[PDB]
Design a protein around this nucleic acid. Structure first.
Length: 252
DNA sequence: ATCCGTA
DNA sequence: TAACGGAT
């Protein structure tokens, strides 16, 4: 199967990703920016318990590390009745220098799919932002408080990877992956590759070309340190769901 | 929690 | 202005 020929390429079988060719990201602040320290709002035990194993996992993965920083933003519990950690990074976002929004809207992106290429593969990358390292100098920006009263735990944690909730993550990820896949595009002139942050579409003129192109794309992604979702993967189909659209016969 | 945008 | 939906 596809899952066994490319074990490195799938979130299921490859372990965590890390885009090794991408230098750790440095996040420039606006000229007048001063650190902001917002106090953590008290969390109910239910929400704390709901969130705890997620925090523990990220610590075990090295994605969260202890720290002490002049920046602090609130951790929110967000619920299905399962709680997930959602950091409110809005006051950090306002203080970070703006970048040009280079991710195309899906309409314009799909306008680049010729009707000549009707064999499709759709892959989405698992925990994409977490594959990009954050430079130690910018890590402090994203600190929050983790207090576990019934374990005598207090202190800040922060991210070593590009974080959810950060206004520039989607754009920075899209740009990083474009740099990492540029050569692939060069080696495969006959293929169409659409990238929308972590959502990929490969289109080919024939099923053979799609099979051979998908193999090469999976191999490339795994080698670069990215991980595709095998569960959601749509491989060499005449019809696929991409970015809310149904792609079929060159339509949509 | 807090911030932004329809009767 | 109260109220809500959606966002972090």
């Amino acid at each position: 199967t596809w899952l066994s020929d490319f074990p490195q390429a799938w979130a299921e079988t490859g372990g965590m990703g890390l885009a090794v060719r991408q230098a750790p990201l440095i996040i420039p602040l606006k000229a007048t920016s001063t650190p902001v320290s917002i106090k953590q709002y008290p969390m109910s035990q239910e929400a704390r318990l709901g969130i705890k194993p997620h925090i523990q996992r990220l610590l075990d993965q090295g994605i969260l590390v202890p720290c002490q920083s002049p920046w602090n933003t609130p951790l929110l519990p967000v619920k299905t009745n399962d709680y997930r950690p959602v950091q409110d990074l809005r006051e950090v976002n306002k203080r970070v220098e703006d970048i040009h929004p280079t991710v195309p809207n899906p309409y314009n992106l799909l306008s680049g799919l010729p009707p000549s290429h009707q064999w499709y593969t759709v892959l989405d990358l698992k925990d994409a932002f977490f594959c990009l390292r954050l430079h130690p100098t910018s890590q402090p920006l994203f600190a929050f408080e983790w207090r576990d009263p019934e374990m005598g735990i207090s202190g800040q944690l922060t991210w070593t990877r590009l974080p959810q909730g950060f206004k520039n993550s989607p754009t920075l990820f899209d740009e990083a992956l474009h740099r990492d896949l540029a050569d692939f595009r060069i080696q495969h002139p006959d293929l169409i590759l659409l990238q929308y942050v972590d959502d990929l579409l490969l289109a080919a003129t024939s099923e053979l070309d799609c099979q051979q192109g998908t193999r090469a794309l999976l191999q490339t992604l795994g080698n670069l340190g990215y991980r595709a979702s095998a569960k959601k993967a749509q491989i060499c189909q005449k019809q696929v769901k991409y970015l809310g659209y149904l792609l079929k016969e060159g339509q949509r």
